[PDB]
Design a binder for this molecule. Sequence first.
Ligand SMILES: [Zn+2]
Ligand SMILES: [Zn+2]
Lengths: 114, 134, 176, 48, 707, 103
Amino acid sequence: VGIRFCQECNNMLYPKEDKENRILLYACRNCDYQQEADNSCIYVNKITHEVDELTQIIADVSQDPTLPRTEDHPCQKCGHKEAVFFQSHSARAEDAMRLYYVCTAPHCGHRWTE
Amino acid sequence: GPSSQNVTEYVVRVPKNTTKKYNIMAFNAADKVNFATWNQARLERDLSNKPEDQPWLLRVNGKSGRKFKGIKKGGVTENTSYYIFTQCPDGAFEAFPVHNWYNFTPLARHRTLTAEEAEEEWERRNKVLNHFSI
Amino acid sequence: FHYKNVTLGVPRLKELINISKKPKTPSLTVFLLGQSARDAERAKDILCRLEHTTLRKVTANTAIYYDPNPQSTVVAEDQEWVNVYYEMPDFDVARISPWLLRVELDRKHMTDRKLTMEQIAEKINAGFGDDLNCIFNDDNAEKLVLRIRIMNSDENMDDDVFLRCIESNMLTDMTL
Amino acid sequence: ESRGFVENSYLAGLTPTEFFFHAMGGREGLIDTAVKTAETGYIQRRLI
Amino acid sequence: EITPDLWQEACWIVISSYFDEKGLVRQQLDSFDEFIQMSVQRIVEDAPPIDLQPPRYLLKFEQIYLSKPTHWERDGAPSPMMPNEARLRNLTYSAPLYVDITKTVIKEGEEQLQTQHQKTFIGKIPIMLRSTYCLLNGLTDRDLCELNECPLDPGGYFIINGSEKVLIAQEKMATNTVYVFAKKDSKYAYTGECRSCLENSSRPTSTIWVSMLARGGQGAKKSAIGQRIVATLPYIKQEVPIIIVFRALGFVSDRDILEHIIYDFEDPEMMEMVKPSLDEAFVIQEQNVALNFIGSRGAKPGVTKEKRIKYAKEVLQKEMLPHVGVSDFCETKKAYFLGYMVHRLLLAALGRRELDDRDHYGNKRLDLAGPLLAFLFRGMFKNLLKEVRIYAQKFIDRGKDFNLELAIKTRIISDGLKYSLATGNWGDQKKAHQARAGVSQVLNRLTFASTLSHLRRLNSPIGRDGKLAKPRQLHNTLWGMVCPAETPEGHAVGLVKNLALMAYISVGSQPSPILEFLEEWSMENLEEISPAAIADATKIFVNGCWVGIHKDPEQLMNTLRKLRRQMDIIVSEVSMIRDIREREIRIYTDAGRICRPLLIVEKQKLLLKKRHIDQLKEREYNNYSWQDLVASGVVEYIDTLEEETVMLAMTPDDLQEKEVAYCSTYTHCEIHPSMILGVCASIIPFPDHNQSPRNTYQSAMGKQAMG
Amino acid sequence: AERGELDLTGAKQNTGVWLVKVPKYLSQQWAKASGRGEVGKLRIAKTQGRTEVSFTLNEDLANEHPFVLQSVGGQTLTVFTESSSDKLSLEGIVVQRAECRPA
Ligand SMILES: [Zn+2]
Ligand SMILES: [Zn+2]
């Protein structure tokens, strides 16, 4: 799923097929450095696009003076009783009125939806 | 250890003259070059530009060794001079001025290519894509 | 601005006064005859049959694997139903082509339109040619998977570029 | 409150964040009248 | 010490301090004093000498002087002209212009003979009334009446052939920033833009796109690889793939290219998108053949090879992103910025950041009299040097000698400015077809409030009949900086606009003293850093140029701010934005941004204690005024961009009380919400009781009332 | 023995050198180096959790500069020379980089 760079000329390693041992070989097209593939899959295309933005929001958003705050929902990892919540603010806005939270305690940065 | 509790004081001199100009030769760490493998080297100003401005050409190991091209940095003493500090047998420090900064990078010897040939290849490949469709 | 989308007022007047071949919002009011005109289920199914459904509206993801033999199955679960296929294997006449395509399906948009894998796999095989092979699961399972292989009768045209070309052609061109 | 519901009247007066919105709505109508007059002076004339 | 519910008389005592010092037409008077103290000295000083040739000669200009406006009588006796005679006798109010020229002859004739002619006459510049260079500067009412002048006249206009001309501020799209749009009609699925200009030194402004082709390209195998990122450089005919123009700067390897464009290699979704960009630039894999590829299609197709490799060298060096650096060195910066321009184009395709807005009023700049006359003075100083050569060569081939007092055609600058101002078309006399019209119209003197409402007027340069509504509708960002009710009807609805009462336009400054502070506050430069220490750092921009990174921004920010609050290193008109999410920091110092003062709020209380009021109602014999109020850190100018990272309260006694409250982190507070109206719309009693279109009619109707 | 021949001795000796950034005004003071070229003395104090280096001007040169140590990681640095006899030599590899800042 990732990418492979040549170890000699630092370029993009293409996948190739050899008719001897039935194993995927990654080859270069400037030099001919070789090696075998460990996962033996090339292409993947996610159309659902249901990526949870809990992996994209940053912990320093709790320094924003223009975001609402809450005393109801406390943090689990530290027990702080003050959070700051917001919406998806991104694409995939068909049914996007969820409410992600971020703890505001210094050096906690814990994030969670509900 | 001495890096923690180590203490000392040494004299610094800045000689108004030197027997040789001092330059910096910089390598990418990512290459992790084993200098021990350098049995010999040749070092000459690059010939594409056909002197003091010339980029360097480094040829490791005489006849059979690696090759790098060194390109001069834009500036070296535009705001602050760079000094080489060396330890002497008397413990005192000696400082040497950096004359220039050259950037050294690795070279790909294998392969040989043509412009007209490459363009011609591109059209045929482009054409093959449009042929035999549906 | 204040009232579907139908143009009124001045721009529809200047669409009728000339004969503009692309009106800005054309429509087509559809009446019904028999039992479909009274019950809601039949009318809904008729609407689903009429409205255009491309294949990418009922897909989840497409993932090109590398199985040189169908008995390897680097995919961690799919040895069961291709082992059901391995009880009687068919179409190994020329060779076995290693490059595979694999579509997951979303059952909300699938069961919304009363479709199944048998008429999709009927359409994407009878209609394209015989250049592919379309195997699929049983409807007992939760996930809907259909594996697609290229035809071996050409290998007896690099098939990675070719198989990605038919992967990005079958997602847009199928008209179910 | 945040998006334009003017809950006062013309006799109780308007708050600032509400007079600005009422100015936006009245502005759109003024633009429409100017554009409409230009359209009128042509379509009808061509038909005659 | 606090101010409880004495507020209604306290807010009107700081507003009085504002207008007693600034006035209502400081907009016009401050951009002129700038154009004539700095922007004119730099133009002649930063001009190439005219070395010319056997012997050869030197000429270079050093210093500029001016004298008070003067009129030459019929028999050649000068005398200072007062602004009144200029109106009666249909004169023109202008001042003569001098310069120092030095001339050295270089013939290596065992002696370098130099000589200079100081205070050489050049031409005459118009003078804006009541400036620092007028005859009415700093006079008292007993003397203003003695010259038959009105003590209430605001000033800020020119007198040209008897008439009274006024310059209209023109709008303009902001420069040196990246904007991402989406043209839904053409081949492109996304587009970026960056108009660059190297610090007021270039007649044109080079613009560069970074496109991306459409997905539904009806084809065979382009179907499989996907869209290819393209670029449309200036001064070339054909589109160019981006990997090619990357290699023309060095960086031939594809591990080094893909670290300027992607800043973290744990992201497979983005790397998949840049993969089909390498496949088409794979066969051309070295520097010199790349320069030939772009060098093959220019304004001149190269017949030989070395000229193309030469031609492609400077166009990629002096026309590509001139705002970053124009020197032939420091080409690692042009690579990072071109990488950031592409890294930002992908984020708009994965749907991780929203597209930019065209009419968002934080992306606009205003051209006052300063940045308008300076643009017109360049094209006429080059035109004056282009014709000292033509007179020197014709006169030195015969080898006689040289004389310069006869080379200078003085009618070039005098009649050049006076023409375009008097007639309006912003161009040249033989160029009455290529110029922008509508500038410099005649002052309106029907009633005294029709005069003030003319010296404060903007103008968006879009067409006057286009039916597109989005450049005409009222935008949310006009709060407090443009009057919402005042606009004319007809065909120019929403195209000309008047600015609010306290709105203040910036004049500009040099970014030198902030850069020298930033480097000593632990900011890593771009060169001496590894591209893997860039994922958790906040890129620091200054004036449009990427100038480093930082690893602890929140302490940098509230250190930059508390310096501006008390005005040590940074002047009060710079704006400093920080967006937490996109993880960067921007700083601006240029001219054209529009500001307005606000009240600074600490934890939940105002910073304006009663001690500031009981000593501000005494300005008459205390010498304590608006300036001593800014320099004490209780008010602050807030730009439009900076106004998106702020939380405002509309009134102290009512919004800053602890309760079950709306917010609790208020950062600023307004002075009085009645300063959001223009000049002609603030004479209406109870304007918050009328229907909205009614307030628009009167503001366009009190301009034609007799008085 | 050739013009384009580079001496590798320093490198092969693994010779180390130190790199220090110095302001021009100080460097202008240094062009007036006292005596043969002496400019002052360097003081180095290391503790269990803190290390301090500074330089003090020669009393003659005067008529404390703390050092900021900078990393040399990410890029290998070595020093190479050109004699007045145009002979070429590699003196060493850079083992330290630093910057002089006022106090
Ligand atoms: Zn390779
Ligand atoms: Zn927490």
